[PDB]
Amino acid sequence: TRPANHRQLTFEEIAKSAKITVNEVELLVMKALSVGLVKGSIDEVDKRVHMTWVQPRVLDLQQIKGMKDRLEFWCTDVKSMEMLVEHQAHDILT
């Protein structure tokens, strides 16, 4: 759910959404890393974890609209940056 903006959650939030206490969530997430469904790092003092890689899931015909839209401007990024190469690098090789 969390975007690539942060995708960094806290043990207070784990204790909120899983309603399991503070001294069990570390064993839970280390078990998750030991299984390897998730790949991330553990900070203890700021009570946050930098979860990076998730186990991939399935989705319906609605999320392909969002992946379509994220594909969409990613096309014209390549168009827009490549047009500088074609325009400016034209006189080097015809």
């Binding site: 940056m81 500088l84 190469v85 400016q88 006189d91 080097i92």
Partner: peptide, 9 residues
């Protein structure tokens, strides 16, 4: 990236 091409010209 413009200026590097301006070097290579």
């Amino acid at each position: 990236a413009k200026q590097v091409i301006e070097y290579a010209r």
